[PDB]
Design a protein that fits this description.
Chains A, B: Belongs to the HINT family. Chains A, B: Keywords: Acetylation, Apoptosis, Cytoplasm, Disease variant, Hydrolase, Neuropathy, Nucleotide-binding, Nucleus, Phosphoprotein, Protease, Thiol protease, Transcription, Transcription regulation, Ubl conjugation pathway. Chains A, B: It is found in: Cytoplasm; Nucleus. The structure is a homodimer. With about 110 residues, chain A is α+β, with helices and mostly antiparallel strands. Helix content of chain A is about 25%, strand content about 25%. Chain A is built from three helices and five strands, in the order H-E-E-E-H-E-H-E. In chain A, a hairpin with a 7-residue loop joins strand 2 and strand 3. Chains A and B meet through helix 2, strand 4, helix 3 and strand 5 of A and helix 2, strand 4 and strand 5 of B. Strand 4 of chain A pairs antiparallel with strand 4 of chain B, so a sheet runs across the interface.
Chain lengths: ~110, ~110
Amino acid sequence: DTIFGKIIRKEIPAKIIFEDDRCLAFHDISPQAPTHFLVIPKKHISQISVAEDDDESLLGHLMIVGKKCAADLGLNKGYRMVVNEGSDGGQSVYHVHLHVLGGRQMHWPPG
Amino acid sequence: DTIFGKIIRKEIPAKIIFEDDRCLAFHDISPQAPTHFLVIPKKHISQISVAEDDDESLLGHLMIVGKKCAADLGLNKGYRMVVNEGSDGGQSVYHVHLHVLGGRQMHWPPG
């Protein structure tokens, strides 16, 4: 369940930007940029390393939802899409979630 | 097009990791981590903000391939996946590309 499950279950409140039969995009509570949100699959996939080849269209779906919400958020100057795998990736929640950061200049390297 | 085009075209060398009929994975020339390689679409989508809703499985396919290469490359302790959009996003080349970074701990915020 994590907090993700409870949020999707609307058990607990989130700054929901978007929703459809496949995902939930809500604002990241500990933003690392002016605008920071997460686009996550309602379906549980702990980490990208274990995403199946049939999981393919959902991953790209998270990606498209991300690009739509970001434009919705007026992110016309740009943004950075992120997914963190495991320990070195700094994966906090073991449920696949796509980070979207904007509102400012991102730097190289990406952490 | 871009250098990514000529790379796809075999015009200029590249440290190729995997190829199939729709995409190419190869090492980043200026790596930002022990393992830093990219996954790019043969179809020239200039950037994610423009990607057709038809590019959804393709954009998912990138991520799929990516995590596969990360696994073939032995990245079993995690890594980070990145998609830079526009100036704020710090998009170096205007042709959709997915970063995969590992070999070391990735920090938060992600740039």
